[PDB]
Design a protein around this ligand. Structure first.
Ligand SMILES: NC(=O)c1ccc[n+]([C@@H]2O[C@H](COP(=O)([O-])OP(=O)(O)OC[C@H]3O[C@@H](n4cnc5c(N)ncnc54)[C@H](OP(=O)(O)O)[C@@H]3O)[C@@H](O)[C@H]2O)c1
Ligand SMILES: COc1cc(Cc2cnc(N)nc2N)cc(/C=C/C(=O)N2NCc3ccccc3[C@@H]2Cc2ccccc2)c1OC
Length: 163
């Protein structure tokens, strides 16, 4: 089980406003689709309710304390510890709560930096590039449907070594 974070955050690490993405950026949702098809998404309950339905062609896992929670096409877990029993490549998909709980545990992060400043009410936790190697950094292409500059980062946790 490779464990990754998958997230879009803006210049101030805003990830959400009123249970929605603050930005309209089709290409990032395509990026998300390409990375996670055939794999597993782990998400908190609020993030799932925002999307409204499972994303097709991958395993949709929802973390919640609700023992009544049962949705067709969705697997449910009730603790963080359950994440580690999931097979394959697992992506931590959001939202703020799950990111805060997992950022110290994941192998790597796929971050789309939205190069703007949006009003938000939910944030990605602060992190420093002193701790994370830039495996790749790719500028998103802008066009008629995708008008906010954005950058795809793949960050891998650096190892702590003596001097
Ligand atoms: N920009 C991005 O890439 C991105 C990605 C995803 C989401 N978002 C945004 O993030 C925002 C939502 O984040 P959020 O923190 O408010 O909600 P969230 O993390 O999506 O969901 C929180 C819920 O997850 C469940 N949960 C979390 N940790 C748990 C644990 N250890 N044990 C049991 N249950 C647990 C609880 O559900 P119960 O209360 O049901 O027990 C909790 O209330 C939205 O605005 C959304 O638009 C942004
Ligand atoms: C809070 O709301 C949301 C949060 C996130 C998390 C997220 C956001 N961004 C980053 N970077 N990380 C992330 N964790 C995500 C979504 C998007 C879901 C979604 O609709 N899709 N996702 C892939 C997918 C795969 C198959 C079919 C449809 C889709 C569509 C896009 C699409 C539509 C048509 C064709 C191709 C793709 C979302 O809802 C707006």
């Amino acid at each position: 089980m490779t464990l990754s974070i998958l997230v879009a955050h803006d210049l101030q690490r805003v990830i959400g406003f009123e249970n929605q993405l603050p930005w309209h950026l089709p290409n990032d949702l395509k990026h998300v689709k390409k990375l996670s098809t055939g794999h597993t998404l782990v998400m908190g309950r609020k993030t799932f309710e925002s999307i409204g339905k499972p994303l097709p062609n991958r395993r949709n896992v929802v973390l919640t304390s609700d023992t009544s929670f049962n949705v067709e096409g969705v697997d449910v877990i009730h603790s963080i510890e359950d994440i580690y029993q999931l097979p394959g490549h697992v992506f931590i998909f959001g939202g703020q709560t799950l990111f805060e709980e997992m950022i110290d545990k994941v192998d790597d992060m796929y971050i789309t930096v939205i190069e703007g400043k949006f009003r938000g009410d939910t944030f990605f936790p602060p992190y420093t590039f002193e701790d994370w190697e830039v495996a790749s950094s790719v500028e998103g292409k802008l066009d008629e449907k995708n008008t906010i500059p954005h950058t795809f980062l793949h960050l891998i946790r650096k190892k702590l070594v003596p001097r």
